[PDB]
Amino acid sequence: MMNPLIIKLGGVLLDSEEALERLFSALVNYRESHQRPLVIVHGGGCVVDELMKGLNLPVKKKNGLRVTPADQIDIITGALAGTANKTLLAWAKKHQIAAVGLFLGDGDSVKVTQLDEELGHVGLAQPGSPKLINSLLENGYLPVVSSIGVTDEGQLMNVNADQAATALAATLGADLILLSDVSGILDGKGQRIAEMTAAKAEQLIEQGIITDGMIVKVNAALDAARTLGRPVDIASWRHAEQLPALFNGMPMGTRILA
Amino acid sequence: MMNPLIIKLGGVLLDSEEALERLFSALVNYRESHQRPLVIVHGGGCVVDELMKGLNLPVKKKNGLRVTPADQIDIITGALAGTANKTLLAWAKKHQIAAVGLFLGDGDSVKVTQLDEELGHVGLAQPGSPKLINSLLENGYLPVVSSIGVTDEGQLMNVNADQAATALAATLGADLILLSDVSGILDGKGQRIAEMTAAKAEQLIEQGIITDGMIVKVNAALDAARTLGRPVDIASWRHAEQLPALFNGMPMGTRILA
Ligand SMILES: Nc1ncnc2c1ncn2[C@@H]1O[C@H](COP(=O)(O)OP(=O)(O)O)[C@@H](O)[C@H]1O
Ligand SMILES: Nc1ncnc2c1ncn2[C@@H]1O[C@H](COP(=O)(O)OP(=O)(O)O)[C@@H](O)[C@H]1O
Ligand SMILES: CC(=O)N[C@@H](CCC(=O)O)C(=O)O
Ligand SMILES: CC(=O)N[C@@H](CCC(=O)O)C(=O)O
Ligand SMILES: [Mg+2]
Ligand SMILES: [Mg+2]
């Protein structure tokens, strides 16, 4: 089988029925026209931010990573490993896609350990075993993986989805594309930056151009690019007409060069 | 491979760390001493009742089944398919058990359709395809399945865990044991009833002895018993010393006769 292609899904578009319908329409068209096996890794920081409101809880992110206290890991796991994951599985079913929902601990796909006591139950993701997912792919299923993981001691961990995607990419030797709610990395004037290198990324970060979630995203992209030795793109899945070319490997956002 | 044994886990014991540690200890001991493949199906009505409190929402059950409005299916899916499911996967990991979390729609394991518009997103579970789970079992994994499902049209459905377990039992041609927070079905004086038949069940229900969740449970048990042609037990997993004999097939609660 060919090297898989991991499509990481994130952004506020995860809360759009029209966006999801358009996306799954394009996924089906791609699947039925390409032999390359697909794997979906999803985030859902928005679903969490909403549930923390209905719950009246605060949201603190220490440089892109959400502080996850022990008293909030269950709620977060519910939102990400449950709600977000099963919502995507429902859309796949609606589109006759045979999918299987998983989290990082299934088949030890992605190894996770506590990153920093200051962050709480936030995990550091690293390559695991590709056996389970490789078998699922060889049997014709579309794995849909959340970013919740678990340590060997049995503690649930919240992994930022971008880092989970990169770790899984190395595990599977797969290509990676990071889809968000913005047309790639934007510059000081808010215009799309076509190509990105580690040196340029550093500059923009120091200048304060790349902040919050995009800092974590560009770093995960660079890691994947140098690890896989292939370019990694950051693009938007907001506009239907661009979806086709996007999956075809066309530069639609910011291409991260190894 | 032998016919699997589905262990359905429910009750308030799902909220007990001591109970969970004791249970997984006995599961490991059973697994390492029996060739019969295990499959876990879990409920978690308690996790839901708590989340509906922190949210300040009402809980209505029309004869054992929780009314699930469209505006609550995502929250419920989060609690059951997410929190409850991943909590059990963490305990399995803690005990070196290679498990894989699934929901009813994975591999179309259990077919689900809307049961009644009066109930909202509550599903009617029926046998599906045993291919995915049979493969997981043959590869050495312990499937841990939640009771959330999805219709062919892509709508998430809340299935009462007892009914999901029975449907999966028929699908896999597996034996079934329903574990709860009570020592089986109790009579008018609150004493354990050793054996149960369809005729006796009807009587007790009409008399008001068997109510709420136990009505759904005894009915699912009877269906499984007549469908599989084998006895189905309803017992408690509260006391550690009883766990061994329980899994060994000893009468610890109420044995449902076909
Ligand atoms: N230079 C930048 N270019 C583009 N987006 C940026 C930049 N700096 C910060 N962002 C923020 O990063 C967000 C995307 O990251 P995030 O919210 O974590 O979503 P996700 O990871 O689910 O795709 C964009 O919505 C934007 O608000
Ligand atoms: N005759 C009865 N015998 C035993 N338990 C009963 C009976 N009638 C009602 N119950 C209730 O059924 C409950 C178990 O059902 P339920 O709460 O749905 O838990 P679960 O399905 O997770 O095991 C018991 O805790 C008890 O409160
Ligand atoms: C640790 C951490 O930041 N986690 C992410 C996971 C979801 C995502 O990437 O969208 C979070 O927002 O909670
Ligand atoms: C429909 C329905 O009653 N669902 C169950 C599922 C969990 C269980 O059986 O514990 C419920 O309480 O929400
Ligand atoms: Mg993000
Ligand atoms: Mg019940």
Curated annotation (Swiss-Prot), chains A, B:
EC number(s) reported in the record: 2.7.2.8
**Does this UniProt record's set of keywords contain ATP-binding?**
yes
Q: Does the keyword Nucleotide-binding apply?
A: yes
Please classify the protein's predominant subcellular localization into one broad category. cytoplasm
Q: State the family it belongs to.
A: Belongs to the acetylglutamate kinase family. ArgB subfamily.
Q: Tell me, how does this one assemble?
A: Homodimer.
Q: Which HAMAP family match?
A: ArgB
Q: What is this protein called?
A: Acetylglutamate kinase
The scientific name of the source species is Escherichia coli O157:H7
Give the gene symbol. Answer: argB
